Amino acid sequence: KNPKSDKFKVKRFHHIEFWCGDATNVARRFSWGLGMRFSAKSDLSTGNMVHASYLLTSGDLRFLFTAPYSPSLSAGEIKPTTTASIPSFDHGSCRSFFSSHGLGVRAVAIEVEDAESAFSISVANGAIPSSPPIVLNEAVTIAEVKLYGDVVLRYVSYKAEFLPGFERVEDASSFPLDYGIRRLDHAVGNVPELGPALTYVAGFTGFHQFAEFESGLNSAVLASNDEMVLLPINEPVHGTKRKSQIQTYLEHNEGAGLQHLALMSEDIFRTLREMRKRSSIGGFDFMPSPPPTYYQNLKKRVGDVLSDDQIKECEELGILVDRDDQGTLLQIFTKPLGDRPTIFIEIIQRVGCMMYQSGGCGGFGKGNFSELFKSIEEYEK
Amino acid sequence: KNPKSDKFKVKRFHHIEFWCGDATNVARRFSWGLGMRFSAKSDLSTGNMVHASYLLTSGDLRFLFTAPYSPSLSAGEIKPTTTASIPSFDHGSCRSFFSSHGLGVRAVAIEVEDAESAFSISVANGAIPSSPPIVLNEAVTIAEVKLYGDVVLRYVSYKAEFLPGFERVEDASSFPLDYGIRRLDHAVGNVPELGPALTYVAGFTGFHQFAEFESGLNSAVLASNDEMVLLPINEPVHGTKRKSQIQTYLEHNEGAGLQHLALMSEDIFRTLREMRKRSSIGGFDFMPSPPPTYYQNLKKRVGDVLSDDQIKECEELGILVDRDDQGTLLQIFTKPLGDRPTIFIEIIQRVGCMMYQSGGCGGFGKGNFSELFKSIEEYEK
Ligand SMILES: Cc1c(C(=O)C2=C(O)CCCC2=O)ccc2c1c(=O)n(C1CCCC1)c(=O)n2C
Ligand SMILES: Cc1c(C(=O)C2=C(O)CCCC2=O)ccc2c1c(=O)n(C1CCCC1)c(=O)n2C
Ligand SMILES: [Co+2]
Ligand SMILES: [Co+2]
């Protein structure tokens, strides 16, 4: 059931912005580890005396890495005279974010028809304003409201390449890496209390609950009208035997924030081959693979979707598989992206639900919690 | 002339410690870019609730990357009960350093015979104390005094693998990268006033001035008894036509600090081939190469040390060449290592002065300032 209750017209995920202490080193690590090309910049070389911002792209996926310069470089500026390319940026906010949370996502940006209207309707329906709408070079409008913790939901609308004041990256500096990643599938927040978090966000967006089909969490998924913007939210379940990874997150992050980004691949096998080749030479590590009993149970569950060879290739790469009513999900999780046990990445591919592929095809893999546990216990046997 | 006036027994450079906001991403970038292996760690997985510290090694070169965790993880600890592996670490100091200076060197560590004695003699002769001597697991002693800006000189002495509380890195996580870098040759500070900086450091170390043989700087080099610990210092020269790069550093760094680290290679040609292959895929960029007139002038200057083929290979890789009374220097400089135009790396190889090779063989390349300018002007012609 999809009531299509969006309070304003939402298109797709636009970008994800990380707040960093040094954007250069994070961006270069991410570029090599995920196979994303350097595509635009806004920094001292482009006249930005306020913040260094580097944009990485893979297909439609846009990752932005931003860090502050010394405030002394821009001490004479005022907001009307700023050289910042992101007018919502604030030195104090950024340093406070990073010192509190460490490396993580500051903004989940979605493209909308009219960012000024989206902001107004949002705050009229309970959204806490973060940065008012600002028109950039009469071409692009940006606005921000609070989403959860210190994460903002950023609205971007275009009248008619990233943002004004960003420059395309020199082709010699721009190596065309590509491991198959194509777009952001979903972005997930961890909160202490799920109910109030959902009521707030669904309240100002009109996003609806996306239907699902002991592991330390309860969760729900908010979705836009065509279910292409997907925002799951987790809360911890306390008092278990094994401590909730949601609770660990909240402790090490100093509260609510973004837990994982799920990146859709056009060929998860190639993506995982390429990423795993680089794990020990500057790229990303992956969670420990399931025991072979997990793959020795996959035939009974998805043998009508994947061949035995394609199942064996899942075993080689540690890929997980889940299935809902309409489709199948291949997924795998990285280890945390930085020093703290907080944000990580999920790589996914969805099979089925053709009409274009409909959003959320195959679900989000919550069945893989019990299947992983089951396979682990029976592998011990 | 070498008076051998060291006030205590100094051995060699031991390590360089960077203070970071996220040690993981910086360390992984540096590992891939410079061909350094992950060799030890101290972090949550080793029981350190205070700071994440990752050690990279190439030959004798040791780079340490440290970042703070949330103070909340260790709020119940006191110094007698700390889980930090580096007892001089302080959350507030580290966050203040990084917010002020961005990514950079906090500690230049040298190995000494007796770190307690080195500290005492140093402060008795004018050194400003930073962290008092602390004995670690009855095995290693660490002490720190101020060097310049917020950079400390760290003394380390061993009674008899990095430091207690650090664990060797898992062989699967430890890929044996190596591009030929073997040791730290020198570490250079930028200061507003050279005279007082030299008087201070030479005052408490007994280091002597190392003899040399319009570019925006004056400099001098302090050296230990066998001239294997080398600490150059630069000051800006104001009122020029082209603004001093030393002054730019001081502005963007918010004052004095470490300008460059010079890393000796056993084969600078292989090192530069390997590093340049990775510049656009997560590694380090290099300064723009000299015009071919520079190499079309090299035969007249070093044709008795390098063959025409080895000179052509310098041209391919952008290597600079200089010569003093006793030896020859091959050198090249990276672009800044992070967001700000502050710290960079120099790769060097020294030819000559065999007795072992004596320290500083070939000098530091200050002649390459005029040779670069000359070649540039005559290339225009
Ligand atoms: C995060 C996640 C998802 C997921 O993506 C998801 C949403 O997208 C939306 C709803 C909630 C929800 O869980 C699915 C399966 C998972 C994990 C996951 O984190 N772990 C962690 C153990 C320690 C680190 C990995 C697992 O073992 N399994 C099997
Ligand atoms: C830093 C350096 C050295 C050097 O290492 C040195 C000391 O070790 C000790 C004494 C002072 C001293 O200069 C030698 C030659 C150099 C440079 C250098 O920074 N540049 C910069 C232009 C813009 C970025 C590169 C150059 O062009 N040349 C030729
Ligand atoms: Co997910
Ligand atoms: Co040098």
Coordinates of C-alpha atoms in Angstrom, one line a residue, chain A residues 20-26 28-32 38 44 52 54 66-73 95 98-100 102-103 172-175 177 251-252 254 277-285 335-341, chain B residues 20-26 28-32 38 44 52 54 66-73 95 98-100 102-103 172-175 177 251-252 254 277-285 335-341:
Chain A
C20 CA 35.9 15.9 7.4
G21 CA 38.9 17.4 9.0
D22 CA 40.9 16.9 5.8
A23 CA 38.8 16.5 2.7
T24 CA 41.8 15.7 0.5
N25 CA 42.9 12.5 2.3
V26 CA 39.3 11.2 2.8
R28 CA 41.5 10.2 -2.2
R29 CA 41.0 7.1 0.0
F30 CA 37.3 6.8 -1.0
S31 CA 38.1 7.4 -4.7
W32 CA 40.6 4.4 -4.8
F38 CA 37.2 13.1 -9.0
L44 CA 41.5 27.8 -2.6
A52 CA 37.7 22.8 0.7
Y54 CA 35.8 17.7 -3.4
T66 CA 34.2 19.1 2.8
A67 CA 36.5 20.4 5.4
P68 CA 37.0 23.9 6.8
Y69 CA 40.0 26.2 6.3
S70 CA 41.4 28.5 8.9
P71 CA 38.7 31.0 9.7
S72 CA 41.4 33.7 9.4
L73 CA 41.4 33.3 5.6
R95 CA 34.4 21.6 13.7
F98 CA 33.6 16.4 13.5
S99 CA 35.0 16.7 17.0
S100 CA 31.7 15.3 18.3
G102 CA 34.2 12.0 13.9
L103 CA 34.1 11.5 10.1
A172 CA 45.0 14.6 -15.9
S173 CA 43.9 14.8 -12.2
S174 CA 40.7 12.9 -13.1
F175 CA 41.4 9.1 -13.6
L177 CA 38.0 4.6 -12.1
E251 CA 27.7 5.5 22.1
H252 CA 30.7 6.0 19.8
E254 CA 27.8 10.7 20.5
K277 CA 41.5 -6.4 -4.4
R278 CA 42.2 -3.0 -2.8
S279 CA 41.2 -3.7 0.8
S280 CA 44.8 -4.0 2.0
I281 CA 46.2 -1.4 -0.3
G282 CA 44.2 1.7 0.9
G283 CA 40.6 0.6 0.1
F284 CA 37.8 -0.8 2.3
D285 CA 37.6 -3.9 4.4
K335 CA 33.8 -2.5 8.1
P336 CA 33.4 1.0 9.5
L337 CA 34.8 3.7 7.1
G338 CA 36.8 5.6 9.7
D339 CA 38.3 5.3 13.2
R340 CA 35.0 4.9 15.0
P341 CA 32.6 1.9 14.8
Chain B
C20 CA 44.6 13.8 12.4
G21 CA 40.9 14.0 12.7
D22 CA 40.5 10.4 11.3
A23 CA 43.7 8.4 11.5
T24 CA 42.3 5.5 9.4
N25 CA 41.7 7.5 6.2
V26 CA 45.0 9.4 6.4
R28 CA 45.4 4.3 4.3
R29 CA 46.0 7.1 1.8
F30 CA 49.7 7.5 2.9
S31 CA 50.2 3.7 2.8
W32 CA 49.1 3.5 -0.9
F38 CA 50.8 -1.2 8.1
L44 CA 39.8 0.2 20.4
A52 CA 43.4 5.6 17.5
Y54 CA 48.3 3.5 13.3
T66 CA 46.8 9.5 15.6
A67 CA 43.3 10.8 16.2
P68 CA 41.2 11.2 19.3
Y69 CA 38.1 9.1 20.1
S70 CA 35.1 10.6 21.9
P71 CA 36.3 11.7 25.4
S72 CA 33.2 10.0 26.7
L73 CA 34.8 6.5 26.1
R95 CA 41.6 18.8 18.7
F98 CA 44.0 20.0 14.2
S99 CA 41.4 22.7 14.2
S100 CA 44.2 25.3 14.2
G102 CA 44.8 21.1 9.9
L103 CA 46.6 17.8 9.2
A172 CA 46.2 -10.4 6.0
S173 CA 45.7 -6.7 6.8
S174 CA 49.4 -6.0 6.2
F175 CA 50.3 -5.9 2.5
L177 CA 54.1 -2.5 -0.2
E251 CA 49.4 32.2 7.1
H252 CA 47.5 29.0 6.2
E254 CA 48.2 29.6 11.7
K277 CA 51.7 5.8 -11.2
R278 CA 49.5 6.4 -8.2
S279 CA 49.1 10.2 -8.2
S280 CA 45.7 10.1 -9.8
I281 CA 44.4 7.0 -8.0
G282 CA 44.7 8.0 -4.4
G283 CA 48.4 8.8 -4.0
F284 CA 50.5 12.0 -4.1
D285 CA 50.9 14.7 -6.7
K335 CA 52.3 19.0 -3.7
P336 CA 50.9 19.7 -0.2
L337 CA 49.8 16.5 1.6
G338 CA 46.4 17.8 2.7
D339 CA 43.8 20.6 2.1
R340 CA 46.1 23.4 3.2
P341 CA 49.2 24.7 1.4

